[PDB]
């Protein structure tokens, strides 16, 4: 809208109320659209026996397809946007403007891989709220998208050559952050909920659970195959809720032709860490908290009292 001159604003992408508001709106956007046949949430408020709230309702099959959502300034506030082509979300931004609303965000719910998002204008960028903390998500933004083609018949395809090149660029950026004398290793998820251990996402209204081991099984800068990567997948009916602690059950698929091709534009990872005189770092696919997903798009925005 209007660029600000001489104005230098201070940003902190890890404490940004836009992320929370959007997280709530996307949650409510899911309830009125994708209703579960059964929904289970804990309730142990009382100091004794636990209780499960159970809701049962009509659960129409819906061929879900996210329309881009814009975050617009609420009454009494304004949106400041950092224009730096490579901004890490923290510190002062010298090139800043004011905007009506954000760019259009796709409210995709997924783990491990960020789909149909924004690419880094220049080089691959990696972000974290605390790189020293091995427990904090590391958000990766690619500058070149990588296609992932999935079918309800039980698999996702990814071009191997493209993925390998992408990994080489991630590893470069990682040792730029953790030490140029370090070997970078990618490994499969170490464990936890299925939604988190597999590349998990929803496609054509269905929840896919894809084994991503083949994507994360390589060593880089250590010493010195098949055309495509085919990840085996599973559509499931009993899902762990991402909106809060609980479980949902949906009905089996009614389509024999579930298909959706996405672009991988980013990754969510965690670093192993731990006291080790070993000059190498291990990285595994992560995610689960969709706020990381929203942060991957909203890092350059900030809401301010007018």
């Amino acid at each position: 809208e209007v660029v600000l001159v001489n104005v230098t604003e201070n940003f902190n992408w890890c404490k940004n109320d836009m992320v929370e508001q959007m997280h709530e709106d996307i949650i409510s956007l899911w309830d009125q659209s994708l209703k579960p046949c059964v929904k289970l949430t804990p309730l142990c408020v009382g100091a004794g026996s636990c209780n499960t709230s159970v809701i049962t309702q009509a659960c129409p099959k819906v061929s879900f397809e996210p329309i881009p959502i814009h975050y617009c300034a609420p009454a009494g506030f304004a949106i400041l946007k950092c224009n730096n082509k490579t901004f890490n979300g923290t510190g002062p931004c010298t090139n800043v403007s004011t905007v009506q609303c954000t760019h259009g965000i796709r409210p995709v719910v997924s783990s491990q891989l960020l789909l149909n998002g924004s690419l880094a204008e220049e080089e691959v960028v990696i972000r974290s709220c605390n790189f020293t903390d091995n427990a904090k998500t590391i958000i990766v933004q690619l500058n070149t998208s990588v296609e992932i083609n999935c079918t309800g018949a039980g698999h996702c395809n990814i071009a191997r050559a493209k993925w390998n090149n992408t990994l080489k660029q991630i590893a470069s950026k990682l040792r730029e952050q953790f030490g140029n004398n370090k070997t970078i290793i990618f490994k499969q998820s170490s464990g936890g909920d299925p939604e988190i251990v597999t590349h998990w996402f929803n496609c054509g209204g269905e929840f896919f659970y894809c084994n991503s081991t083949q994507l994360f099984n390589s060593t880089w800068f250590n010493s010195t195959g098949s055309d495509t990567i085919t990840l085996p997948c599973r559509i499931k009916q009993i899902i762990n809720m991402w909106q809060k602690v609980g479980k949902m059950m949906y009905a089996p698929p009614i389509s024999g032709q579930i298909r959706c091709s996405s672009n991988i534009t980013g990754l969510l990872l965690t670093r192993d860490g731990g006291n080790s005189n070993n000059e190498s770092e291990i990285f595994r696919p992560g995610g689960g908290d969709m706020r990381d997903n929203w942060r991957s798009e909203l890092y350059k925005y900030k809401v301010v009292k007018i």
Partner: antibody
Amino acid sequence: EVQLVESGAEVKKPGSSVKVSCKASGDTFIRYSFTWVRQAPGQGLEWMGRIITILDVAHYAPHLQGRVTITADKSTSTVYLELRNLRSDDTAVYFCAGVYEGEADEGEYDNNGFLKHWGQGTLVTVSS
Amino acid sequence: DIVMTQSPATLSVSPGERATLSCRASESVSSDLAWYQQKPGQAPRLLIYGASTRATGVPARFSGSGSGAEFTLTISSLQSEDFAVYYCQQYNNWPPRYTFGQGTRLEIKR
């Protein structure tokens, strides 16, 4: 293939409660859903309710809502039917029945409404 | 509430001949329809599910057809062990409120 064995015949006064059981053996318990169906002498079959064992969630027929409870004990592979405030017209043979729902422990669930496996039945007589 | 209605109440068939059993619904139940066989003193036995899929152990002379609000059970050649009571069951609705027809008694015509 699961084998369903139900508990013995029951005789109750009107106004009492009854709790009949059903031991499922032969297969993986939490991969089945279990349904209770009853049949009054000389009458047809009547669906009473069904439990999604893996989730521990049961749904009941409207004319029964409020006085029927279906439970499942996973440590013993046993399904239970409780019918409260018994009436003389509750006299019937009560059948335990079940069907395989898929690899439920991996989140696959067909929610089948049909009934492949059946117990031998339990006669419940309600009379003064 | 979905009311299932079977006809006729009693079907009399000479041995070795074909029997046709009817089942109707008060509203569409798509293909969530099953057929059971029951002999005096015994539990019901699943024959057909999904309107037309035979259960394991069910011989080929049993076939189900139809969808929506009208269904048929056909037995192409009645054997001695086929004479029994036959029930249909609808399981289309959610929340589940599944219901049975009142049965067709198939007896030996002499």
